[PDB]
Design a protein around this ligand. Structure first.
Ligand SMILES: O=C(NCCc1ccncc1)NC1CCCCC1
Ligand SMILES: *[C@@H]1O[C@H](CO)[C@@H](O)[C@H](O)[C@H]1NC(C)=O
Length: 358
């Protein structure tokens, strides 16, 4: 079990002004620290944030959080379930800022909600340094879905923070799961008039302004004022990052298909949709060709790393916990211990180890 700590700096808050926090299980014999960012969509105006507050409140408030959580998948402390990092210090950071971990704005006379995701990560790191993170050798910032995009936006800021605080020996690394999206041509098209019709590029442009969203400086300098939305797309931000980053991405991610206005239904896939899906997998493989640490199976699914059966999927006969172990060795190519694992078959579930869904 991981135990809840609400932040001591209570000016760093969830959307409704309640304090943010983290869940910690610590491993006193270990100098490895895993900090995991939860996902779960986002909101980008008053009306869609108000609706999220009524039916997704744990993603906007700490008032009802439980005192403990059980670690699963990569957050499990049992080697049977987590062959990779079972003995590490474990931290789960709940997503309660609705801003893809980018925001830097407080609730105030002019702001009904606070969007503090970038500040929440900084404050968790600060408070952990007094609880043993000061002695760390490796800090792995991991996350799934909106949390995986959050890793790409924040990993170099955590590295800079630790340098400026006087901890240059801590090696900061990132693990981005299900957060690598394409700003591609959609299968059907609507102009952005409400939540359901707004494509991701348009919704993120509006969100950055509503949240006071921040992006990595080297990416911001390329795209410049007004164009910061580009830095939310993995293939554009990744080449600007200096910390080592391992990318996990299903080739046919269900969230990518949803934002492309594709809905698998009743089994009748005609030629136009067949070509659309095959081209999506080819484009996503193309973006990963020069990413040396990656795991990209040909499946229709969503998230991997905190699922209890995360070890089952294999690419070319190698599981994700094995590839992450090989990545660790690479940062000390390796015979029989690969780190770049991208499927080449062209259709969902052409890999027999894909999740069934049951
Ligand atoms: O839109 C997303 N994820 C899907 C959010 C979602 C979830 C459930 N229904 C509808 C939408 N992430 C964005 C993509 C563009 C890059 C920055 C993150
Ligand atoms: C609390 O966090 C805010 C926002 O990051 C920061 O400006 C402030 O200095 C912090 N308070 C203390 C006492 O460090």
């Amino acid at each position: 079990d991981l135990r809840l700590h609400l932040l001591l700096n209570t000016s760093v808050t969830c959307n409704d002004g309640s304090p943010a926090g983290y869940y910690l299980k610590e491993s006193r014999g270990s100098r490895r620290w895993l900090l995991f960012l939860e996902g779960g969509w986002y909101c980008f105006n008053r009306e869609n944030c108000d609706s999220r507050y009524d039916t997704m409140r744990r993603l906007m408030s700490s008032r009802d959080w439980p005192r403990t959580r059980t670690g699963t998948g990569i957050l499990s402390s049992q080697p049977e379930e987590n062959p990779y990092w079972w003995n590490a210090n474990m931290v789960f950071i709940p997503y309660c800022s609705s801003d893809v971990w980018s925001g830097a704005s407080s609730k105030s006379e002019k702001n009904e909600y606070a969007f503090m995701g970038a500040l929440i990560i900084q404050e968790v790191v600060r408070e952990l340094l007094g609880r043993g993170l000061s002695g760390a050798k490796v800090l792995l910032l991991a996350g799934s879905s909106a949390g995986g995009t959050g890793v790409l936006l924040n990993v170099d800021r955590v590295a800079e923070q630790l340098e400026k605080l006087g901890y240059p020996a801590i090696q900061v690394r990132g693990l981005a799961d299900s957060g690598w999206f394409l700003d591609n041509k959609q299968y059907r098209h609507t102009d952005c008039v409400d939540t359901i019709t707004c494509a991701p590029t348009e919704a993120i442009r509006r969100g950055i302004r509503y949240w006071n969203g921040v992006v990595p400086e080297r990416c911001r300098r390329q795209f410049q004022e007004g164009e910061e939305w580009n830095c939310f797309f993995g293939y554009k931000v990744y080449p600007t990052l200096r910390s080592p980053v391992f990318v996990v991405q299903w080739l046919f991610d269900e969230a990518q298909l949803t934002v492309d206005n594709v809905h698998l239904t009743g089994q009748p896939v005609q030629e136009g949709l067949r070509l659309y899906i095959q081209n999506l997998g080819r484009e996503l493989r193309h973006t990963l060709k020069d990413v040396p640490a990656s795991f990209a199976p040909a499946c229709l699914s969503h998230e991997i790393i905190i699922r209890s059966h995360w070890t089952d999927v294999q690419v070319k006969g190698t599981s994700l916990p094995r590839a992450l172990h090989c990545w660790d060795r690479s940062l000390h190519p390796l015979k029989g211990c690969p780190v770049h694992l991208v499927d080449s078959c062209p259709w969902p579930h052409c890999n027999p180890s894909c999740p069934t869904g049951t």
